[PDB]
Amino acid sequence: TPVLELLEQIQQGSEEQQKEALARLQELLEAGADPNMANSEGTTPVLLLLEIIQQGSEEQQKLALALLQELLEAGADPNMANSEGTTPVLLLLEIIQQGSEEQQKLAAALLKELLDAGADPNMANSEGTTPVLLLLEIIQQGSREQQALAMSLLLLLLLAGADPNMANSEGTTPKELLKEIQQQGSDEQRLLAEVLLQLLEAAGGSWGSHHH
Amino acid sequence: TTPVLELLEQIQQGSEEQQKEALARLQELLEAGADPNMANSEGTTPVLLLLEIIQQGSEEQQKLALALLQELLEAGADPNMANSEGTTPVLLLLEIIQQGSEEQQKLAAALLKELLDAGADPNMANSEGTTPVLLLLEIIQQGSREQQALAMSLLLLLLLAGADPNMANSEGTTPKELLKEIQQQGSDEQRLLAEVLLQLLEAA
């Protein structure tokens, strides 16, 4: 598909070629290009773009926010997962989980774009890992920068409608993971865990009973 | 005064034997058609008097009054009816947390959820314009480590209920303005809570 190869020519192109990437995508989309056409393995233009961010230079990174808004404005489905079952939001959080501090700041901004585009905050991957459960992993095993960022994004997801009780395939609930963060976490990790544990304990039996 | 108010008055200024059967007595009084909103001469509603009992009462009186609040709210007590000074039940609860024991703090957190489920306005301020969010940030700024964590989760519980994080008080002090102050001179844990709330606000 024309869109997918262009994205491949951005990752596999020069830095000066990157200058023409936003314009080329705009002229390709205006020409009637499908912003959702996946390739043989099911990678969508959004997923490949996030994949470029994950493996690209800082120059390729700053380019991708405009390329994502262009794809989202063109009508890309923000919930279309790849063949493995990885949603753009779950791939974004993996970029935060394993990325540099620069990638962390970017994927945080891209997540807001995806939520605005209409991404499902409860859509899990093939293993049942929800966006909330992955953010709790980022808090438990991430840096002090990742702790605060994953903390605010989790509240952002809860406000967006994420349910803090959905478990994964192994039956691991977010509350079970919060107890782990409290038991063996740092002074700051335990504080974040105690906050989230108190929030859950007061609206766990009925999440949304006061959302009026 | 009002039979509901008279019963509540007998609990705080009475012995412990009166307290055990009080929940049953209120259940039969409300079922008999007693108005759970009738205030006295000073404007104290049955809910506001019950919160006064929690703040000044023994631990026995405290856990009894949490069940008594559920009864009054189910009977149709207004969770937004403030006293003559203009202090709403949620704002009085937070003041109880701000100055109360760890036991009173744990109790008042459950009453806030009961009030919010009843339909309490999360943005209703007092006469001074202090909003529930702004007061919770004060509890975070100058409270204990236990009060820090609890006021934090109550702040998120209020945001989930629809609290606006941009409402300022009468002096024009915004919640973001207070969060920066917590970050500049707060502890390592207070600064983390402030940085979290600052990132959340800037992103939505």
Residue numbers in the entry:
A (entry chain H): 3 to 214
B (entry chain A): 2 to 205
What do the authors say?
However, because of the intrinsic flexibility and irregularity of loop regions, organizing multiple structured loops at protein functional sites has been very difficult to achieve by de novo protein design. Here we describe a solution to this problem that designs tandem repeat proteins with structured loops (9–14 residues) buttressed by extensive hydrogen bonding interactions. Experimental characterization shows that the designs are monodisperse, highly soluble, folded and thermally stable. Crystal structures are in close agreement with the design models, with the loops structured and buttressed as designed.
The in silico validated designs span a diverse range of shapes with different repeat protein curvatures and loop geometries and adopt multiple loop buttressing strategies using loop–helix hydrogen bond networks and loop–loop bidentate hydrogen bonds. From a fundamental design perspective, the crystal structures presented here show that computational protein design has advanced to the point that proteins with multiple ordered long loops can now be designed. Key to this success was the design of dense networks of hydrogen bonding and nonpolar interactions within and between the loops and between the loops and the underlying secondary structural elements.
